Amino acid sequence: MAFIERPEDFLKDKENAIQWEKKEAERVEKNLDTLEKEALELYKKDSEQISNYSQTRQYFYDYQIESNPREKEYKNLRNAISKNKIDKPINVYYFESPEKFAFNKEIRTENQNEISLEKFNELKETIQDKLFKQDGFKDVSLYEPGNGDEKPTPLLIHLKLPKNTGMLPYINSNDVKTLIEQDYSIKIDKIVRIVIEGKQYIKAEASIVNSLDFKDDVSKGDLWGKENYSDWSNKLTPNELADVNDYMRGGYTAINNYLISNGPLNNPNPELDSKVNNIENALKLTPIPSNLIVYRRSGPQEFGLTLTSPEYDFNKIENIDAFKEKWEGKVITYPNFISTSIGSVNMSAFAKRKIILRINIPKDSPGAYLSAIPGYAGEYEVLLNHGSKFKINKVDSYKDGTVTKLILDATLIN
Amino acid sequence: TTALVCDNGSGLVKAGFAGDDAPRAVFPSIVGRKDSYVGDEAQSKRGILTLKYPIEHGIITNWDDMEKIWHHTFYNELRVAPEEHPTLLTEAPLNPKANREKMTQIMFETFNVPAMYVAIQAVLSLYASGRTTGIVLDSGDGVTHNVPIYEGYALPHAIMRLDLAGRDLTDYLMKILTERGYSFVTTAEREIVRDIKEKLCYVALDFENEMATAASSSSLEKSYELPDGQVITIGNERFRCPETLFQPSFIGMESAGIHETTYNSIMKCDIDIRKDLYANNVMSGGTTMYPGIADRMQKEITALAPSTMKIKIIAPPERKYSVWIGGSILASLSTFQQMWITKQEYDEAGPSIVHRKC
Ligand SMILES: *[C@H]1O[C@H](COP(=O)(O)OP(=O)(O)OC[C@H]2O[C@@H](n3cnc4c(N)ncnc43)[C@H](O)[C@@H]2O)[C@@H](O)[C@H]1O
Ligand SMILES: Nc1ncnc2c1ncn2[C@@H]1O[C@H](COP(=O)(O)OP(=O)(O)OP(=O)(O)O)[C@@H](O)[C@H]1O
Ligand SMILES: C/C1=C/C(=O)O[C@@H]2C[C@@H](CC[C@H](C)/C=C/C=C/CC1)O[C@@](O)([C@@H]1CSC(=O)N1)C2
Ligand SMILES: [Ca+2]
């Protein structure tokens, strides 16, 4: 028997979950125009690729993105999902590959029924104190898989989705399904070892952290930046405004090579020391007013490589393995000030850079939308404070033409 | 009553009188650091002094030094009083607003000019060839830009920048000649290598082909006499040097090359004008002077554009001064006279009058 209001979590009540979601599909079908339906039908036929496109579409030139015919499907299916917002939280269930959370080995083989203790602690040590960014279309279940359900990995994600989360219940052949577009980071609050049909699984109790991620929508981003940092060069003491502009108009090279070389300890210098102090407090003036995703296409020497380093060839899988082995899960420090952008799109000036740093910036971190100053060299730029530390949560790779590039999912930990 | 045209670049200032067909003075955009030193006379006193370049990548970054450049321009190069001449200045594409305002403030408050104007360099270049629509590749000593222009209007959202130009090419040629077995490293040696670059380099139509050929022929080898009389030989360095423009990775840069920035710029423009841009690719600046650059650009753009596209690269013999020439024509136009910002307008509205542009 069912209550007349749904619960936040159907748990193992498979039967009410399915019937409820079946009625939801039927209601939601009344709100979709045929372009949305067509997009839904196309999704059933071509799921993998439509989902794969939705994960990495935002990293190309603005004009390449715009010319891509897969945009129609992306935009129309996104819109279908966005229409249908839940009016209170709901918990969902899906399986995930462990390498998704940077655990690049099997928890157990599909033939093993049990998971070792050390495996368990290794997973736990890998996946906690970490925000993992998620993107793209995903099918999720409203009930915990049980006896007779498809169970493709030893890792079950049990995720709480908040109010106003877009969700698209639908029917495919004889299955009731639920579609979301991931646009948030997940926090694994707890893992526990359970058993289902005679095998041990890891169940991850997970929740969501929201952040402004403008991706390729640089106009919306720039609107957001301008309307948050317009006042900002008004609130700078005149002493700060000069050093900022000095930095901005080519001073950054002197200031940053000073920081990187430990000048203030080695061959100290009072003038540009007051400059570092002024630029810093300028960054403390309007702290980043929401959780925010920014992007930086990094030079290879930020990661101990050169253009000609054979280990910068990420088309070779072992070079990707090696890079992960070196950097994934590590914290990383920039003694210099660093530039990032609100936009994810590729650009002429960095067109060939292979390493993209995709950074989570907590609300109130020091920084500023410098591109609220008319005509600044940096495209949609956010400047972060000297000595910033970034935890590298996860390394992904994608294909830009024939070239393999990396996306470093990272978090500003101050 | 004769207007002045001052085209201030990263490496060179080109200056003269509106109505003339060439600048009367062209001198280095350097300051020695009126006891302080500028222009040609600052090079030989370096010194208890080294040379400073106040314009970096097309942008004025030191205003004190820039006042000295401009003082030197009026008094020593042109030998005029600034109070007696309307002065047309040039600026880089996307020059910050505050920068424009500061140029205006200095002209009126420091130099007391009766009138002035700031023009976009790429636009003047385009005007010099009698055009108002086209995409300009402007490559000098310090910066290179693509600037698409439609009926006299620069389209700023489609402007592509590269901080790679003549000086990087000179410096690269120093390195690869040094790898050949010579030694080119000092500031004086950099001038010599610049001269070698200007006299003997060229852009290969097919780079990999031309590298294969280099190991075979010596019809590509050329010689050059140093000031002390040593005659040196230069081979594949002739075309590897400017190849950097199309392959910025040669100097460790991960930016798009100039064919790709040209294409990117066109793709950021309205679909309806793109054929106008493809058919009016105009080159200006000293770093577009390489024999073979136009043919190579033709071929590279052809590889990127639709097979049905009509592509034309316009590279006038005068293109090393087409910005200046464009300013000279402009400042002489009857319809331009209403556009000068007068001293009275500055008094009335302050530096921000440059954006209204009178
Ligand atoms: C358009 O292009 C330029 C400059 O772009 P960048 O943001 O790459 O310039 P940076 O100053 O950030 O890069 C300087 C070079 O030094 C390397 N780097 C930077 N920080 C470090 C650290 N901390 N450690 C080792 N290397 C570092 C970078 O890889 C880069 O090569 C500008 O005009 C834009 O508008
Ligand atoms: N024949 C030539 N071949 C190749 N390069 C040349 C030639 N003549 C001049 N150059 C180079 O062109 C550059 C100067 O050109 P130009 O005066 O247009 O630049 P600028 O205006 O000083 O700099 P920018 O426009 O980058 O601010 C120098 O680097 C010079 O070596
Ligand atoms: C004929 C000529 C052309 C020129 O463009 O000079 C400009 C200006 C010059 C200033 C420094 C020297 C010492 C003083 C020189 C007086 C020079 C007139 C030189 O520095 C450049 O040489 C740099 C270095 S090497 C290069 O590629 N750009 C560009
Ligand atoms: Ca110039």
Curated annotation (Swiss-Prot), chain B:
Region of interest (Interaction with alpha-actinin), ranges: 94-107, 342-354
Q: ADP-ribosylarginine occurs at which residues?
A: R161
Reaction(s) catalyzed by this protein? ATP + H2O = ADP + phosphate + H(+)
EC identifiers of the protein? 3.6.4.-
Name where it's found: Cytoplasm, Cytoskeleton
Query: In the record, which positions carry N6-malonyllysine?
Result: K45
Tell me the GO BP annotations in alphabetical order. Answer: actin filament bundle assembly; actin filament polymerization; mesenchyme migration; positive regulation of gene expression; skeletal muscle fiber development; skeletal muscle thin filament assembly
Keywords annotated in UniProt: Acetylation, ADP-ribosylation, ATP-binding, Cytoplasm, Cytoskeleton, Hydrolase, Methylation, Muscle protein, Nucleotide-binding, Oxidation
Point out residues bearing the modification Tele-methylhistidine: H57
Q: Which GO terms describe its cellular component?
A: actin filament; actin filament bundle; cell body; cytoplasm; filamentous actin; filopodium; lamellipodium; skeletal muscle myofibril
PTM section of the record: MICAL1 and MICAL2 produce the (R)-S-oxide form. The (R)-S-oxide form is reverted by MSRB1 and MSRB2, which promotes actin repolymerization.
Looking up Pfam families in the UniProt record yields:
Actin
Family matches, as InterPro entries? Actin, Actin/actin-like_CS, Actin_CS, ATPase_NBD
Molecular function GO terms recorded: actin monomer binding; ATP binding; calcium ion binding; calcium-dependent protein binding; cytoskeletal motor activator activity; hydrolase activity; identical protein binding; magnesium ion binding
Residues annotated as carrying N6-methyllysine in the record are K68
Further remarks about this protein from its record: In vertebrates 3 main groups of actin isoforms, alpha, beta and gamma have been identified. The alpha actins are found in muscle tissues and are a major constituent of the contractile apparatus. The beta and gamma actins coexist in most cell types as components of the cytoskeleton and as mediators of internal cell motility.
Which protein family is named in the record? Belongs to the actin family.
> What is its biological role?
Actins are highly conserved proteins that are involved in various types of cell motility and are ubiquitously expressed in all eukaryotic cells.
Q: What interactions and quaternary structure are annotated?
A: Polymerization of globular actin (G-actin) leads to a structural filament (F-actin) in the form of a two-stranded helix. Each actin can bind to 4 others. Interacts with alpha-actinin. Identified in a complex composed of ACTA1, COBL, GSN and TMSB4X. Interacts with TTID. Interacts (via its C-terminus) with USP25.
UniProt-recorded name of the protein:
Actin, alpha skeletal muscle
The species is Oryctolagus cuniculus
**Gene this protein is translated from:** ACTA1
